Design a protein around this ligand. Sequence first.
Ligand SMILES: *[C@@H]1O[C@H](CO)[C@@H](O[C@@H]2O[C@H](CO)[C@@H](O[C@@H]3O[C@H](CO[C@@H]4O[C@H](CO)[C@@H](O)[C@H](O)[C@@H]4O)[C@@H](O)[C@H](O[C@H]4O[C@H](CO)[C@@H](O)[C@H](O)[C@@H]4O)[C@@H]3O)[C@H](O)[C@H]2NC(C)=O)[C@H](O)[C@H]1NC(C)=O
Ligand SMILES: *[C@@H]1O[C@H](CO)[C@@H](O[C@@H]2O[C@H](CO)[C@@H](O[C@@H]3O[C@H](CO)[C@@H](O)[C@H](O)[C@@H]3O)[C@H](O)[C@H]2NC(C)=O)[C@H](O)[C@H]1NC(C)=O
Ligand SMILES: *[C@@H]1O[C@H](CO)[C@@H](O)[C@H](O)[C@@H]1O
Ligand SMILES: *[C@@H]1O[C@H](CO)[C@@H](O)[C@H](O)[C@@H]1O
Ligand SMILES: *[C@@H]1O[C@H](CO)[C@@H](O)[C@H](O)[C@@H]1O
Ligand SMILES: *[C@H]1O[C@H](CO)[C@@H](O)[C@H](O)[C@@H]1O
Ligand SMILES: *[C@H]1O[C@H](CO)[C@@H](O)[C@H](O)[C@@H]1O
Ligand SMILES: *[C@H]1O[C@H](CO)[C@@H](O)[C@H](O)[C@@H]1O
Ligand SMILES: *[C@H]1O[C@H](CO)[C@@H](O)[C@H](O)[C@@H]1O
Ligand SMILES: *[C@H]1O[C@H](CO)[C@@H](O)[C@H](O)[C@@H]1O
Ligand SMILES: *[C@H]1O[C@H](CO)[C@@H](O)[C@H](O)[C@@H]1O
Ligand SMILES: *[C@H]1O[C@H](CO)[C@@H](O)[C@H](O)[C@@H]1O
Ligand SMILES: *[C@H]1O[C@H](CO)[C@@H](O)[C@H](O)[C@@H]1O
Ligand SMILES: *[C@H]1O[C@H](CO)[C@@H](O)[C@H](O)[C@@H]1O
Ligand SMILES: *[C@H]1O[C@H](CO)[C@@H](O)[C@H](O)[C@@H]1O
Ligand SMILES: *[C@H]1O[C@H](CO)[C@@H](O)[C@H](O)[C@@H]1O
Ligand SMILES: *[C@H]1O[C@H](CO)[C@@H](O)[C@H](O)[C@@H]1O
Ligand SMILES: *[C@H]1O[C@H](CO)[C@@H](O)[C@H](O)[C@@H]1O
Ligand SMILES: *[C@H]1O[C@H](CO)[C@@H](O)[C@H](O)[C@@H]1O
Ligand SMILES: *[C@H]1O[C@H](CO)[C@@H](O)[C@H](O)[C@H]1O
Length: 422
Amino acid sequence: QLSGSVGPLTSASTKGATKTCNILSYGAVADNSTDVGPAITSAWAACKSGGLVYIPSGNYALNTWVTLTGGSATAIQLDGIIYRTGTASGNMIAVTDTTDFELFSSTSKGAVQGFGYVYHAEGTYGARILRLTDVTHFSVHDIILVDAPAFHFTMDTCSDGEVYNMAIRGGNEGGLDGIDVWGSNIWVHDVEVTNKDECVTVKSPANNILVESIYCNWSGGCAMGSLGADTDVTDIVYRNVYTWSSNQMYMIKSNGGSGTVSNVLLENFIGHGNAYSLDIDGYWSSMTAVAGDGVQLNNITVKNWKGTEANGATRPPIRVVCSDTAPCTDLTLEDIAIWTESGSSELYLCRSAYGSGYCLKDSSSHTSYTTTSTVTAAPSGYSATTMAADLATAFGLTASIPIPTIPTSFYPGLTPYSALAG
Ligand SMILES: *[C@@H]1O[C@H](CO)[C@@H](O[C@@H]2O[C@H](CO)[C@@H](O[C@@H]3O[C@H](CO[C@@H]4O[C@H](CO)[C@@H](O)[C@H](O)[C@@H]4O)[C@@H](O)[C@H](O[C@H]4O[C@H](CO)[C@@H](O)[C@H](O)[C@@H]4O)[C@@H]3O)[C@H](O)[C@H]2NC(C)=O)[C@H](O)[C@H]1NC(C)=O
Ligand SMILES: *[C@@H]1O[C@H](CO)[C@@H](O[C@@H]2O[C@H](CO)[C@@H](O[C@@H]3O[C@H](CO)[C@@H](O)[C@H](O)[C@@H]3O)[C@H](O)[C@H]2NC(C)=O)[C@H](O)[C@H]1NC(C)=O
Ligand SMILES: *[C@@H]1O[C@H](CO)[C@@H](O)[C@H](O)[C@@H]1O
Ligand SMILES: *[C@@H]1O[C@H](CO)[C@@H](O)[C@H](O)[C@@H]1O
Ligand SMILES: *[C@@H]1O[C@H](CO)[C@@H](O)[C@H](O)[C@@H]1O
Ligand SMILES: *[C@H]1O[C@H](CO)[C@@H](O)[C@H](O)[C@@H]1O
Ligand SMILES: *[C@H]1O[C@H](CO)[C@@H](O)[C@H](O)[C@@H]1O
Ligand SMILES: *[C@H]1O[C@H](CO)[C@@H](O)[C@H](O)[C@@H]1O
Ligand SMILES: *[C@H]1O[C@H](CO)[C@@H](O)[C@H](O)[C@@H]1O
Ligand SMILES: *[C@H]1O[C@H](CO)[C@@H](O)[C@H](O)[C@@H]1O
Ligand SMILES: *[C@H]1O[C@H](CO)[C@@H](O)[C@H](O)[C@@H]1O
Ligand SMILES: *[C@H]1O[C@H](CO)[C@@H](O)[C@H](O)[C@@H]1O
Ligand SMILES: *[C@H]1O[C@H](CO)[C@@H](O)[C@H](O)[C@@H]1O
Ligand SMILES: *[C@H]1O[C@H](CO)[C@@H](O)[C@H](O)[C@@H]1O
Ligand SMILES: *[C@H]1O[C@H](CO)[C@@H](O)[C@H](O)[C@@H]1O
Ligand SMILES: *[C@H]1O[C@H](CO)[C@@H](O)[C@H](O)[C@@H]1O
Ligand SMILES: *[C@H]1O[C@H](CO)[C@@H](O)[C@H](O)[C@@H]1O
Ligand SMILES: *[C@H]1O[C@H](CO)[C@@H](O)[C@H](O)[C@@H]1O
Ligand SMILES: *[C@H]1O[C@H](CO)[C@@H](O)[C@H](O)[C@@H]1O
Ligand SMILES: *[C@H]1O[C@H](CO)[C@@H](O)[C@H](O)[C@H]1O
């Protein structure tokens, strides 16, 4: 949950009035051929303190990556489309050590076409599209990120930020994270993600993060981690998350390590067609083990989950696997009604976890244990609707991905918090 106000300190109109650096004035050519990188860099240099970097409608080729740093009361208005032509590694666009910042499109049509499929068709990965590091008092909204060669959007140690009204659509494989975030006091809402890895995921250290109205439309799903040594994650809320045809509805992953994860609320989730549903995994096999007794998870509430999973017999819809040497404590599982899409039974798995709900123990002696429960009849009230835009098929790995429009519907029965800019 947020600890204070988020977003830029001054409006884009105020910054624009101070000074507008139109990239066409810094050598940019909207010919979908001439490298726009240098122009953005020169425009930033002139407008990074109090001004606004403006990218008018048109098609631009990005051949060399840009690293924009040291801004103060600045903004970038992306009203055109950037196409990746560069082949270097790294981040196509990186904004670092900047305060009072806004990255947006006034038309709700600004986009970055990463052409990640060129790499994926060959079994490889390329640059990430966007990375914000140590950015404070900011907002990123009304933009579209498509087919990143690797990650789409990472917020590395940022704070007092708001991210919303975005569509992120990437390839159908792991390694193509949607939004990865760590820092403090960040509000993410009204975002749709397609890929086969992180939907909106929190990493350590992080405190006071609110994530809601998220539409994981064929994705890896939301998660927390991987968590390792010296973990410190606290006051995290995810609510009103709709997940379709994904790896999971929510996963907390660690494998050894230390530190603590506390005060997490995951409520109002709906899922259909996923591999896993609730998957707390303290022995996540996809990551090499970290020295320590295990990250201590405490006071985690999972409430009001409904829907169906592809196969609840092979993948327990309720899977709570904690460290035997660092038992989960104070977990509250309440009103989780998930049923299986094939078969007539499903399993609930609990390992060394304490609290109240389903297979959890409410004991005093937090010793380890392993238990499996077979449910032979559909939990009452598992029925939940679907979203009209649920993908019938994903975008593969060998053909370009068409640029989507930003939707105005993310979770059943709710409307977006903020109207689209255009
Ligand atoms: C901005 O600039 C970017 C480049 O950075 C443009 O992206 C390229 O767009 C063009 C289309 O305008 C793409 O080329 C066409 O791709 C077609 C599909 O790809 C092929 O698929 C077949 C079958 O799977 C394979 O055999 C090929 O190996 C390719 O993978 C392709 O079929 C087509 O080929 C035919 O092109 C012309 C006209 O169709 C024929 O005359 C020619 O003989 C050939 O047979 C094109 O090559 C190109 O792939 C895109 N680049 C990338 C990286 O995706 C944007 O389109 C530009 N945007 C704007 C708005 O201008
Ligand atoms: C376990 O974790 C939960 C969060 O996951 C903690 O809940 C939070 O507890 C506080 C106090 O009970 C709730 O009250 C809030 O207080 C502030 C300031 O007074 C006020 O601004 C809010 O309007 C609200 O009243 C807070 O809302 C609640 N968080 C959520 C998301 O509901 C809980 O305290 C932890 N329990 C233990 C034993 O540590
Ligand atoms: C259950 O017992 C211990 C924990 O209590 C596990 O380590 C073991 O794998 C079994 O499933
Ligand atoms: C629950 O049962 C499953 C098999 O159905 C085991 O894999 C697990 O360790 C626990 O005993
Ligand atoms: C499956 O259905 C009933 C529902 O009451 C279960 O309680 C029982 O275990 C059976 O095998
Ligand atoms: C760990 O071991 C103790 C004693 O066997 C139990 O009381 C507890 O429920 C858990 O199985
Ligand atoms: C879980 O782990 C404890 C020790 O950490 C054992 O006592 C128990 O038998 C199970 O393996
Ligand atoms: C999980 O389920 C098994 C069998 O129902 C129990 O024996 C165990 O104590 C835990 O409740
Ligand atoms: C298997 O056991 C769990 C508790 O261990 C029940 O919640 C479930 O209904 C099934 O009987
Ligand atoms: C459910 O519980 C056990 C867990 O060991 C399953 O293996 C069995 O099929 C039962 O129905
Ligand atoms: C069956 O029972 C559940 C609570 O366990 C309700 O949520 C549902 O509406 C139905 O009455
Ligand atoms: C699932 O059900 C809801 C109402 O419960 C509809 O609004 C939706 O279109 C879908 O049919
Ligand atoms: C079960 O009930 C829900 C809402 O009550 C529907 O949306 C779903 O399609 C199914 O009929
Ligand atoms: C999800 O699926 C239901 C039917 O199962 C539709 O009513 C809804 O529009 C969406 O396609
Ligand atoms: C690209 O990947 C292969 C061809 O390399 C196709 O099977 C797939 O449908 C996509 O067009
Ligand atoms: C992927 O990208 C290429 C180039 O923009 C298009 O030709 C194709 O239709 C898809 O949008
Ligand atoms: C936003 O706009 C869409 C159409 O793009 C509507 O379907 C939705 O209800 C919301 O008004
Ligand atoms: C988003 O908006 C659509 C209408 O376009 C609803 O059907 C959905 O439940 C959510 O409110
Ligand atoms: C998105 O923006 C609107 C105003 O346009 C706010 O009211 C909302 O809280 C969110 O910041
Ligand atoms: C974006 O807007 C189009 C219509 O303009 C709609 O078809 C899409 O579903 C939405 O994401």
